[PDB]
Enzyme design. Structure first.
Site, PDB file in Angstrom:
ATOM      1  N   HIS A   2       0.906  -1.473  -0.036  1.00  0.00           N
ATOM      2  CA  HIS A   2       0.015  -0.107   0.003  1.00  0.00           C
ATOM      3  C   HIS A   2       0.855   1.274  -0.167  1.00  0.00           C
ATOM      4  CE1 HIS A   2      -3.989  -1.774   0.591  1.00  0.00           C
ATOM      5  NE2 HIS A   2      -3.313  -2.608   1.558  1.00  0.00           N
ATOM      6  N   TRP A   5      -1.171   4.231   1.689  1.00  0.00           N
ATOM      7  CA  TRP A   5      -1.882   3.896   3.164  1.00  0.00           C
ATOM      8  C   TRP A   5      -0.652   3.497   4.156  1.00  0.00           C
ATOM      9  CZ3 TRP A   5      -5.629   6.262   5.444  1.00  0.00           C
ATOM     10  CH2 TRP A   5      -6.750   6.605   4.651  1.00  0.00           C
ATOM     11  N   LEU A 159     -15.745  10.594  -1.512  1.00  0.00           N
ATOM     12  CA  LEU A 159     -14.749  10.696  -2.333  1.00  0.00           C
ATOM     13  C   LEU A 159     -14.898  10.252  -3.758  1.00  0.00           C
ATOM     14  CD1 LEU A 159     -11.584  10.890  -2.752  1.00  0.00           C
ATOM     15  CD2 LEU A 159     -11.314   8.419  -1.300  1.00  0.00           C
ATOM     16  N   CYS A 160     -14.503  10.698  -4.705  1.00  0.00           N
ATOM     17  CA  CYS A 160     -14.730  10.665  -5.935  1.00  0.00           C
ATOM     18  C   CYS A 160     -13.916  11.144  -7.009  1.00  0.00           C
ATOM     19  CB  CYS A 160     -16.451  11.299  -6.401  1.00  0.00           C
ATOM     20  SG  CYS A 160     -16.707  10.564  -8.214  1.00  0.00           S
ATOM     21  N   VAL A 161     -13.089   9.878  -7.846  1.00  0.00           N
ATOM     22  CA  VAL A 161     -12.585  10.823  -8.932  1.00  0.00           C
ATOM     23  C   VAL A 161     -13.080  10.162 -10.276  1.00  0.00           C
ATOM     24  CG1 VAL A 161     -10.113  10.176 -10.245  1.00  0.00           C
ATOM     25  CG2 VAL A 161     -10.356  10.633  -8.082  1.00  0.00           C
ATOM     26  N   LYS A 168      -4.531   7.152 -11.487  1.00  0.00           N
ATOM     27  CA  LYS A 168      -3.435   8.107 -11.683  1.00  0.00           C
ATOM     28  C   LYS A 168      -2.970   8.738 -10.123  1.00  0.00           C
ATOM     29  CE  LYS A 168      -5.124   9.261 -16.055  1.00  0.00           C
ATOM     30  NZ  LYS A 168      -3.977   9.667 -16.990  1.00  0.00           N
ATOM     31  N   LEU A 170      -4.401  10.485  -8.049  1.00  0.00           N
ATOM     32  CA  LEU A 170      -5.351  11.525  -7.632  1.00  0.00           C
ATOM     33  C   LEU A 170      -6.043  11.524  -6.198  1.00  0.00           C
ATOM     34  CD1 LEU A 170      -5.675  14.514  -8.206  1.00  0.00           C
ATOM     35  CD2 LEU A 170      -7.731  13.722  -9.596  1.00  0.00           C
ATOM     36  N   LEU A 411     -24.121   8.267   5.835  1.00  0.00           N
ATOM     37  CA  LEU A 411     -25.078   8.401   4.723  1.00  0.00           C
ATOM     38  C   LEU A 411     -24.490   8.123   3.475  1.00  0.00           C
ATOM     39  CD1 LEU A 411     -26.122  12.021   5.866  1.00  0.00           C
ATOM     40  CD2 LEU A 411     -27.355   9.679   6.319  1.00  0.00           C
TER      41      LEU A 411
HETATM   42  C1  LIG Z   1      -7.881  14.221  10.621  1.00  0.00           C
HETATM   43  C2  LIG Z   1      -8.649  14.657   9.162  1.00  0.00           C
HETATM   44  C3  LIG Z   1      -8.229  13.047   8.208  1.00  0.00           C
HETATM   45  C4  LIG Z   1      -9.129  13.063   6.957  1.00  0.00           C
HETATM   46  C5  LIG Z   1      -9.063  12.151   6.082  1.00  0.00           C
HETATM   47  C6  LIG Z   1      -9.378  10.579   6.589  1.00  0.00           C
HETATM   48  C7  LIG Z   1      -9.052   9.815   5.648  1.00  0.00           C
HETATM   49  C8  LIG Z   1     -10.337   9.514   4.582  1.00  0.00           C
HETATM   50  C9  LIG Z   1     -10.004   8.296   3.654  1.00  0.00           C
HETATM   51  C10 LIG Z   1     -11.301   8.464   2.542  1.00  0.00           C
HETATM   52  C11 LIG Z   1     -12.392   7.697   2.951  1.00  0.00           C
HETATM   53  C12 LIG Z   1     -13.663   7.963   1.625  1.00  0.00           C
HETATM   54  C13 LIG Z   1     -14.636   7.241   2.276  1.00  0.00           C
HETATM   55  C14 LIG Z   1     -15.376   7.081   0.832  1.00  0.00           C
HETATM   56  O1  LIG Z   1     -16.027   8.139   0.356  1.00  0.00           O
HETATM   57  S1  LIG Z   1     -15.959   5.514   0.422  1.00  0.00           S
HETATM   58  C15 LIG Z   1     -16.734   5.830  -1.435  1.00  0.00           C
HETATM   59  C16 LIG Z   1     -15.344   5.906  -2.446  1.00  0.00           C
HETATM   60  N1  LIG Z   1     -16.073   6.207  -3.684  1.00  0.00           N
HETATM   61  C17 LIG Z   1     -16.150   5.367  -4.825  1.00  0.00           C
HETATM   62  O2  LIG Z   1     -15.749   4.231  -4.616  1.00  0.00           O
HETATM   63  C18 LIG Z   1     -16.449   6.066  -6.128  1.00  0.00           C
HETATM   64  C19 LIG Z   1     -16.104   5.548  -7.498  1.00  0.00           C
HETATM   65  N2  LIG Z   1     -14.507   5.158  -7.422  1.00  0.00           N
HETATM   66  C20 LIG Z   1     -13.571   6.492  -7.291  1.00  0.00           C
HETATM   67  O3  LIG Z   1     -14.142   7.620  -7.550  1.00  0.00           O
HETATM   68  C21 LIG Z   1     -12.184   6.105  -7.284  1.00  0.00           C
HETATM   69  O4  LIG Z   1     -11.947   4.524  -7.540  1.00  0.00           O
HETATM   70  C22 LIG Z   1     -11.440   6.501  -5.897  1.00  0.00           C
HETATM   71  C23 LIG Z   1     -11.651   7.728  -5.665  1.00  0.00           C
HETATM   72  C24 LIG Z   1     -12.375   5.691  -4.907  1.00  0.00           C
HETATM   73  C25 LIG Z   1     -10.132   5.754  -5.769  1.00  0.00           C
HETATM   74  O5  LIG Z   1      -9.525   6.657  -7.200  1.00  0.00           O
HETATM   75  P1  LIG Z   1      -8.494   5.776  -7.899  1.00  0.00           P
HETATM   76  O6  LIG Z   1      -9.110   4.478  -8.235  1.00  0.00           O
HETATM   77  O7  LIG Z   1      -8.296   6.574  -9.181  1.00  0.00           O
HETATM   78  O8  LIG Z   1      -7.218   5.150  -7.387  1.00  0.00           O
HETATM   79  P2  LIG Z   1      -6.082   6.335  -7.046  1.00  0.00           P
HETATM   80  O9  LIG Z   1      -4.924   5.674  -8.123  1.00  0.00           O
HETATM   81  O10 LIG Z   1      -6.217   7.754  -7.284  1.00  0.00           O
HETATM   82  O11 LIG Z   1      -5.581   6.083  -5.606  1.00  0.00           O
HETATM   83  C26 LIG Z   1      -5.150   4.486  -5.237  1.00  0.00           C
HETATM   84  C27 LIG Z   1      -5.019   4.494  -3.680  1.00  0.00           C
HETATM   85  O12 LIG Z   1      -6.280   4.852  -3.244  1.00  0.00           O
HETATM   86  C28 LIG Z   1      -6.799   3.957  -2.396  1.00  0.00           C
HETATM   87  N3  LIG Z   1      -8.137   3.775  -2.158  1.00  0.00           N
HETATM   88  C29 LIG Z   1      -8.739   3.143  -2.867  1.00  0.00           C
HETATM   89  N4  LIG Z   1     -10.333   3.300  -2.667  1.00  0.00           N
HETATM   90  C30 LIG Z   1     -10.384   3.830  -1.708  1.00  0.00           C
HETATM   91  C31 LIG Z   1     -11.452   4.201  -0.913  1.00  0.00           C
HETATM   92  N5  LIG Z   1     -12.880   3.997  -0.766  1.00  0.00           N
HETATM   93  N6  LIG Z   1     -10.906   4.923   0.258  1.00  0.00           N
HETATM   94  C32 LIG Z   1      -9.576   5.184   0.731  1.00  0.00           C
HETATM   95  N7  LIG Z   1      -8.707   4.786  -0.174  1.00  0.00           N
HETATM   96  C33 LIG Z   1      -9.060   4.197  -1.217  1.00  0.00           C
HETATM   97  C34 LIG Z   1      -6.077   2.514  -3.072  1.00  0.00           C
HETATM   98  O13 LIG Z   1      -6.118   1.445  -1.499  1.00  0.00           O
HETATM   99  C35 LIG Z   1      -4.718   3.268  -3.196  1.00  0.00           C
HETATM  100  O14 LIG Z   1      -3.716   3.381  -2.068  1.00  0.00           O
HETATM  101  P3  LIG Z   1      -2.842   2.368  -1.761  1.00  0.00           P
HETATM  102  O15 LIG Z   1      -3.186   0.935  -1.662  1.00  0.00           O
HETATM  103  O16 LIG Z   1      -1.754   2.529  -3.026  1.00  0.00           O
HETATM  104  O17 LIG Z   1      -1.932   2.663  -0.409  1.00  0.00           O
END
Ligand SMILES: CCCCCCCCCCCCCC(=O)SCCNC(=O)CCNC(=O)[C@H](O)C(C)(C)COP(=O)(O)OP(=O)(O)OC[C@H]1O[C@@H](n2cnc3c(N)ncnc32)[C@H](O)[C@@H]1OP(=O)(O)O
Length: 411
Positions: A2, A5, A159-161, A168, A170, A411
């Site tokens: 990861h 992460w 969260l949405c790309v 990529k 993002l 939600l």
């Molecule tokens: C103190 C304040 C803290 C605030 C922040 C707290 C944390 C919040 C965290 C977010 C909580 C969100 C809660 C919700 O909304 S869960 C709803 C998530 N949205 C969807 O499923 C919508 C459709 N899919 C997309 O839009 C994308 O495929 C997303 C945006 C999900 C990933 O985009 P993409 O597919 O283009 O990939 P990348 O190349 O940019 O990036 C890849 C990296 O992303 C990791 N990844 C994949 N899916 C998720 C996921 N659901 N949460 C966390 N991380 C996720 C993956 O393990 C990898 O990391 P690593 O394995 O390489 O290490």
């Protein structure tokens, strides 16, 4: 495994999480003054944008991004279609922070590319009951109670790309900039849920569904006709019959919630939620915001007999686009929200939820096995679904708990 992460303050393996015995932070203490003042860097062709999620046109831009690019199943049959009215309700609770709503747009023309949203919540997240018993056995009660006070944290969602920008890297940039904005407000933990398995959940529960319009659910291939029904001359007639509901509520005194119910509903809800290890603390303003009825969005009913409110339930609406069927456009789903039962059994309360949702044109009722939702699954004919909702914290060590010790609805 990861690359992102592994660089974050979360527990990294199941075996580590099995070892955690008290609640508390993962990272060293930091101050607002330690956190960069400027946005995280991003490619020169992109730009950060904070939408105003109370202004109709900005809400619409975010609605179209999610309509076309948010959660869909692996067979591309259904994709969530959160409404504009729902996004304004979810994203703007009392004391919300506009800066925590984070977008990327293409600089040249302003095309929306990506989004992530944070909202404030007050959450009980101290050491759970079973681990406090272990602490007592060992003479470690003081460490186990150090973080018992409810904490003002961030809940992240949406969260949405864009589909053209997948894989990529993002998403990590969105998460890092959200984290910075939150930390610049002196908040250091977050809570989030996902259907995917990441490092590392503190709780995980199955999804459950209750069919309300089984002929439509079979037609759009959400449901199939189960094999034993083939022993009947008319399988679909028997399926309809199996799921049929009353046309009107059964509980005397059921009516819609109104503003004057807010204090009595806050009292019975908070007394109930207190029995769970992880759960929210709501003010009168947050009970009004999350439970007062809003058309097309949140539906809430109380049982009042002889002038006293003794019980209540709520559900929320998220339609999904039906991608491939040429007879239906939308799947109209009702999701079980908060509830509290003091005068009647929980199954009797929730049967009137199903009666109301069916009467209003919903096709299915969904929920996860949190709160006491397991207690009415069999009687009310819910069935387990595919996969699981996993609960996570950011920057908070926490012992594994059962989903029936989670009282926070996401939600
Ligand atoms: C103190 C304040 C803290 C605030 C922040 C707290 C944390 C919040 C965290 C977010 C909580 C969100 C809660 C919700 O909304 S869960 C709803 C998530 N949205 C969807 O499923 C919508 C459709 N899919 C997309 O839009 C994308 O495929 C997303 C945006 C999900 C990933 O985009 P993409 O597919 O283009 O990939 P990348 O190349 O940019 O990036 C890849 C990296 O992303 C990791 N990844 C994949 N899916 C998720 C996921 N659901 N949460 C966390 N991380 C996720 C993956 O393990 C990898 O990391 P690593 O394995 O390489 O290490």
């Amino acid at each position: 495994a990861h690359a992102f992460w592994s660089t974050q303050p979360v527990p990294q393996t199941e075996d580590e999480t099995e070892k955690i015995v008290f609640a508390g932070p993962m990272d060293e203490p930091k101050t607002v003054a330690d956190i960069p003042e400027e946005p995280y860097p991003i490619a020169s062709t992109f730009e950060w944008w904070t939408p105003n999620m109370e202004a109709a046109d900005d809400i619409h831009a975010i609605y179209e991004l999610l309509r076309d690019n948010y959660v869909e199943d692996d067979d591309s049959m259904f994709r969530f279609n959160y409404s504009e009215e729902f996004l304004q309700w979810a994203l703007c609770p009392p004391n919300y922070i506009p800066d925590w709503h984070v977008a990327v747009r293409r600089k040249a023309d302003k095309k929306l590319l990506a989004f992530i949203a944070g909202v404030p919540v007050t959450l009980r997240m101290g050491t759970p009951k079973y681990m406090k018993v272990k602490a007592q056995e060992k003479g470690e009660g003081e460490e186990a109670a150090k973080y018992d006070e409810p904490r003002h944290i961030c809940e992240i969602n949406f969260l949405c790309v864009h589909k053209q920008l997948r894989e990529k890297r993002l998403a990590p940039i969105l998460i890092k900039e959200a984290t910075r904005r939150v930390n610049r407000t002196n908040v250091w933990q977050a809570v989030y849920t996902a259907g995917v398995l990441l490092p590392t959940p503190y709780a995980s529960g199955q999804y459950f569904h209750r069919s309300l319009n089984p002929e439509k659910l079979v037609e759009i291939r959400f449901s199939g006709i189960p094999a034993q029904y083939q022993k009947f001359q008319n399988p679909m007639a028997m399926l309809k019959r199996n799921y049929q509901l009353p046309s009107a509520p059964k509980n005397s005194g059921l009516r819609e919630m109104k503003p004057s119910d807010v204090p009595q509903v806050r009292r019975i809800l908070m007394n109930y939620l207190d029995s769970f290890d992880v759960g929210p603390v709501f003010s009168d303003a947050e009970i009004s915001h999350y439970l007062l009825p809003r058309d097309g969005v949140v539906f809430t009913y109380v049982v009042e007999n002889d002038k006293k409110v003794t019980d209540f339930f709520s559900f929320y609406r998220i339609p999904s686009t039906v991608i491939g069927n040429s007879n239906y456009n939308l799947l109209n789903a009702a999701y079980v929200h908060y509830y509290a039962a003091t005068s009647i059994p929980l199954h009797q309360l929730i049967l009137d939820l199903l009666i109301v949702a069916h009467s209003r044109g919903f096709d299915v009722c969904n929920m996860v096995e949190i709160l006491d939702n397991r207690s009415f699954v069999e009687q009310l004919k819910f069935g387990a679904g595919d996969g699981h909702l996993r609960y996570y914290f950011y920057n908070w060590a926490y012992p594994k708990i059962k989903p029936s010790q989670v009282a926070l609805v996401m939600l």
